[PDB]
Structures are given as structure tokens and as C-alpha cells.
Amino acid sequence: FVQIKFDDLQFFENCGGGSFGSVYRAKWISQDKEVAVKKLLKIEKEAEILSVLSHRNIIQFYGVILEPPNYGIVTEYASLGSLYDYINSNRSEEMDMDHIMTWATDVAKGMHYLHMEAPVKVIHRDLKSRNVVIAADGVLKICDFGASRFHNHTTHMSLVGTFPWMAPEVIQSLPVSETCDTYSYGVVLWEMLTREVPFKGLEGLQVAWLVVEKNERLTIPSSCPRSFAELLHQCWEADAKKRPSFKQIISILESMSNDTSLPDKCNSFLHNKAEWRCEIEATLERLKKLER
Ligand SMILES: COc1n[nH]c2ncc(-c3cn(-c4c(F)ccc(NS(=O)(=O)c5cccc6ccccc56)c4F)nn3)cc12
């Protein structure tokens, strides 16, 4: 639970501006290290139980700032930015099947560590593409895994914005198991495949209602390979007990990566977005219209 003095940080982005939970690029002066700094209202000593977690697919803890009123947590800075920004940029056109498999495996692995391998079991509860970042070598790192337990206050702002990623039982404050993260993972995989914002332009409460009451799920284009479509359907089951664990997902991904037919089918799908984008847009028009 290393303490980093506020005076040992050179901020690139003014740390005054954002709400609690905002993250700033900074330099850790005495270490000559680029870092991320998440601004917090306060942090409890108990948070030290998570300071020992370490895995190549979760963001690496560096230290804590403990000088009132300045509180924060310091981590590694992933040089390529957030997964959400990448997906929704034209840069995502570069992605082929190998890219997607590697990144899908990255997230799955990090979530398996949190669920099963860490000294303290962690259910994320807020997994989404905005909470994944891309390190300089392309390794994906999961962020905010301790938010739900140690700084839940940071999760309030655009809770509505997050509804597309939230399992029905989380939206309803029903009993929650580790598989709530499998549901969210399914949405992240859908984003990588379609490179679209889930339920784009839809009111969050409307999303939440459709997901919970009508069993609505994100549109899977008909030309999406069946192995991927099936994985998404498993992640998205209403009955949380029937969703796969991350151990099971990893095994599914390994099976898919041995399928010699898949790369051509998937790459043809990925590069065909001009063809199937209308399928997603049609569902959105329909849901918006039916709301009217
Ligand atoms: C364009 O944006 C970007 N580009 N490159 C980037 N690299 C990194 C980041 C980036 C870092 N964090 C970031 C952060 F600073 C502080 C904490 C967290 N998580 S935590 O659960 O609170 C947490 C983590 C580790 C140990 C914990 C121990 C107890 C409690 C909570 C703990 C976090 F996730 N968030 N985002 C954005 C970007």
C-alpha cells in the first residue's frame, strides 16, 4: 500500500476539472514513470487488501495519495488509450480475427484472475469497454475492478450511460453472482465485432427496461460467424447460472482459434460492415420508433 506524495506527481491534465473518478495522466517524479491518477473523495485503509493484485490483464497498482483534501490511487498508464475510444474510431478498421481473439482472450484472462486466482476474489460489476485500456504492446488491462467495493461513489455519474453493459440482475439489484461480469464481457465482445456503441441513442432507462422485462439483447448481424454468435448468446442468458465462467469462455476461445474455417469467415464479416451495419441501425430505429 505504497504512499505517493501529491508533490511527487507532475500532472499533464489539470486535476481540478473532473468529477470524482476522473483519471489524469501524470508523471511520478521520483520514479520517472508515466502514471494514471484517479481522483477520489477519500480512500479507506481497508483498500490495501486489493493493492496486492497483479496480473498482465489488470491495471497495475502503484500507490495511493493520502493528503487531505487530495486523495487518489495511482496506476500504470497504458499508452494506447481506452478500448472504447479505439473501437469507435476509424483505427478499428485494422482489426482482423487474430486481433479480436487476442483481445477477447486478454479480457477473459484478466477477469478469470479477478474471479478465481487473486488473493481476494473480485466481482467487477462495472466491466465495460471504457474500463479497459490498451498498453503499448497491445495488451489489454482491466480498470476500476475495485470501484464497486472501495469507491462506489465514482460509479454514479452516467449510470444511465452504463446500462447497455449491465446484467439484468445488476439493473434490478437482484442477487448477483460472478456471471454478471460474463454478461458485460459479452457486450464488450459485441463492441469489438461490430465497432458500434451498444443501444446507441437509446434512453438508458429504456435500455434497462428492454433488457430486464423484454429480454432484449444487442442485434447480432446474420453474417456474424456462428461460433461468435453462440458465445454472445451464452454470455447474455437471462438465467445467470447458465452463463459461462471465464474459465469456460477461455476454453471456447481456444476451440475457436483451432477452427481453420473461422478466420476467413470472421475476417469477411469484420470487413463487411458496410453490408450489415443497417441490420443494427434497423433495430435501433425500431426500438426508438416503438417508444414513440
Ligand atoms: C485515455 O485514457 C487512458 N489512456 N491510457 C490510460 N491508462 C490508464 C488509465 C486508467 C487508470 N485507472 C485507474 C486508476 F488511475 C486508479 C485506480 C483504478 N482502478 S481501481 O479499481 O480503483 C484500483 C486499481 C488497482 C488497485 C486498487 C486497490 C484498491 C482499490 C482500487 C484499486 C484505475 F482503473 N483508470 N483508468 C486510463 C488511460
**Cell for 221?**
448481424
| Number of separate domains in the chain | 2
Give the domain CATH number at 53.
3.30.200.20
Atom of ligand 1 nearest to the CA of 50: 28
- Residue 165's nearest CA partner among 137, 138, 187, 144 is 187
Give residue 236 CA to ligand 1 midpoint distance, Å.
27
Give the dihedral sign, CA 118/123/127/130: negative
Residue 104 and residue 64 share a domain: no
The amino acid at 253:
L
Atom of ligand 1 nearest to the CA of 154: 22
Residue 69 and residue 120 share a domain: no
Maximum pairwise Cα distance, the chain: 58
Cα angle 12-59-9, degrees, rounded to a multiple of 5:
30
**Three-state secondary structure of the chain:** CCECCHHHEEECCCCCCCCCCCEEEEEEHHHCEEEEEEEECCCCHHHHHHCCCCCCCECCEEEEEEECCEEEEEEECCCCCEHHHHHCCHHHHHCCHHHHHHHHHHHHHHHHHHHHHCCCCCCCCCCCHHHEEECCCCCEEECCCCHHHHCHHHHCCCHHHHHHHCCHHHHCCCCCCCHHHHHHHHHHHHHHHHCCCCCCCCCHHHHHHHHHHCCCCCCCCCCCCHHHHHHHHHHCCCCHHHCCCHHHHHHHHHHHHCCCCHHHHHHHHHCCHHHHHHHHHHHHHHHHHHHC
Rounded to an integer, what distance in angstroms lies between the CA atom of residue 247 and that of residue 291?
Answer: 39
Give the domain CATH number at 268.
1.10.510.10
Residue 52 and residue 90 share a domain: no
CB 143 within 8 A of CB 59: yes
Determine the residue of 38, 65, 71, 129 to mutate for testing ligand 1's pocket, defined as the one with the most ligand atoms within 8 A of the Cβ atom. Answer: 38
Rounded to an integer, what distance in angstroms lies between the CA atom of residue 250 and that of residue 104?
Answer: 9
Ligand 1 first shell, C-beta below 6 A = 23, 36-38, 47, 50-51, 59, 61, 73, 75, 77-78, 81-82, 133, 143-147, 150
Determine the residue of 9, 23, 57 to mutate for testing ligand 1's pocket, defined as the one with the most ligand atoms within 8 A of the Cβ atom. Answer: 23
Residue 126 and residue 4 share a domain: no
Annotated catalytic, 98? no
Query: Residues 6 or more apart from 143 whose CB is under 8 A from it?
Result: 58, 59, 75, 131, 132, 133
Closest residue to atom 20 of ligand 1, CA basis: 144
Rounded to an integer, what distance in angstroms lies between the CA atom of residue 34 and that of residue 28?
Answer: 6
Residue 146 and residue 14 share a domain: no
- Long-range Cβ contacts of 207-211 (<8 Å, 24+ apart): 207/163, 207/164, 208/163, 208/166, 208/171, 210/287, 211/163, 211/166, 211/168, 211/171
Residue 121 and residue 266 share a domain: yes
Give residue 59 CA to ligand 1 midpoint distance, Å.
6
| Cβ neighbours of 232 (radius 10 Å) | 18
N residues, the chain: 292
Give residue 222 CA to ligand 1 midpoint distance, Å.
37
Of 79, 104, 136, the domain-final residue: 79
Phi, psi of 108 (to 5 degrees): -60, -40
Tell me how the structure was determined. Answer: X-ray
Of 55, 79, 103, the domain-final residue: 79
Rounded to an integer, what distance in angstroms lies between the CA atom of residue 112 and that of residue 218?
Answer: 24
Residue 137 and residue 48 share a domain: no
- Residue 157's nearest CA partner among 13, 23, 6 is 23
Residue 185 and residue 172 share a domain: yes
Of 57, 79, 101, the domain-final residue: 79
Give residue 274 CA to ligand 1 midpoint distance, Å.
35
Phi, psi of 260 (to 5 degrees): -70, -25
Closest residue to atom 11 of ligand 1, CA basis: 36
Residue 127 and residue 56 share a domain: no
Out of 106, 126, 144, 181, which one is annotated catalytic?
Answer: 126
Rounded to an integer, what distance in angstroms lies between the CA atom of residue 42 and that of residue 65?
Answer: 10
Residue 261 and residue 152 share a domain: yes
Residue 90 and residue 61 share a domain: no
Rounded to an integer, what distance in angstroms lies between the CA atom of residue 187 and that of residue 211?
Answer: 12
Rounded to an integer, what distance in angstroms lies between the CA atom of residue 290 and that of residue 283?
Answer: 10
**Cell for 210?**
428492454
Rounded to an integer, what distance in angstroms lies between the CA atom of residue 123 and that of residue 149?
Answer: 9
Residue 225, domain extent: 80-292
Residue 106 and residue 48 share a domain: no
